[PDB]
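Forum > Structural Biology > Help requests

Title: Can anyone predict the 3D structure of Zika virus NS3 helicase domain?

Hi all, first post here. I have the sequence for Zika virus NS3 helicase domain but no way to get a structure on my laptop. I'd be grateful if someone could post the structure tokens.
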Amino acid sequence: MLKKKQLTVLDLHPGAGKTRRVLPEIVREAIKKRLRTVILAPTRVVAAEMEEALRGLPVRYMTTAVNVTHSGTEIVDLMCHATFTSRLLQPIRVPNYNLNIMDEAHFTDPSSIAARGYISTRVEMGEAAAIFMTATPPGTRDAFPDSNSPIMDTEVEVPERAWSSGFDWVTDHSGKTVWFVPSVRNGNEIAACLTKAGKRVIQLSRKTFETEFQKTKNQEWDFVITTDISEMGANFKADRVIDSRRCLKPVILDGERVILAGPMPVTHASAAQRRGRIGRNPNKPGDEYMYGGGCAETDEGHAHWLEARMLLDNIYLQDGLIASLYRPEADKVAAIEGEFKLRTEQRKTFVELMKRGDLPVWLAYQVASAGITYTDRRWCFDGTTNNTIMEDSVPAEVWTKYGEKRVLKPRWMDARVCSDHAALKSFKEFAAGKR
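Reply #1:
Sure, ran it for you. Structure tokens for Zika virus NS3 helicase domain below:
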């Protein structure tokens, strides 16, 4: 697989040993052939598990998740998918890796889609080799792949709100359950219902993942309530997965706003990855998978793919050439290559609104493309009356950097800045000039 010009998809079933067995062998072969290599982890939690599997091999860990003193003689770098894309965007030269390995290559966050598009383009050009590691490559239609041990698959009605009766099977279980919910707010209601029933519940989401995932190892628990982030390599010692089979879909309406549509069905890849959390121990047959809906290709028209085109249009590749999306996922968005290419100063603003501002890609692009500078926050208050952001059914208010109390009313409305309490608190700090 290491020969130039080729992209290999390593699609072994979940738990087949892609990370702990195949990855170290690939790395040893790459170091033997003197290939400058990058290893891309979806999260800092996966990067730490990779360090355990790669111990004894010269790897440069470009992440604060690992505490290792580097020798300086490493030709293999390890970083998360988002750091790879961010460094490509920033005015820092990234080496032209001869071998690019992406673990959990099914990750649908805009930065992972951009990384696959950039790497696959370099491979098409004949400059590099790549290995995409995932049980569920783009376009997979099988939500029931193979496993290390047999799984009991049961289609059943799964509660998406607090319940008082009709779901005895949920609480009458004596093992550990991983339950996938469509959103943080939906998880809060179910966790509260399970806590009132006497269950020990841990909740996981993108922002709290690294911190709260440690609790799954450090303390006894009955249920883990998680968004889709746990589809990316998160391992549990559990015997059941309850799957709502639903997710939220960011959708761009009329090219002027982003809504969080749904909950709606997950893709086959997401369902197979959610189910993939169990049936991993060959000595423990009969782990359960309870699913409450069907699958659909909800990645079509999903804003993450349009956002990946905004990132790819602003990454230098060669003169005016622009990287295409990875072919199997390239029809998910109606987009013309280069339509989002920004001039030098506007691109620097676009990068800073994402990196320091913490804004979603689409929103950062609207602000940068309008000729607004990073610290100018007047756009957070000059939108139409229908863009008024609501908190507890009352308009959200902030003291501007001038000392004036104003209602948060952004010129461009992106529902992701207020998807939960923590998101809106962060956006209010942004509108106030606090970062």
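The two ends are 45 Å apart (CA to CA). The domain at 151-291 is CATH 3.40.50.300 (Rossmann fold).
Shout if anything looks off.
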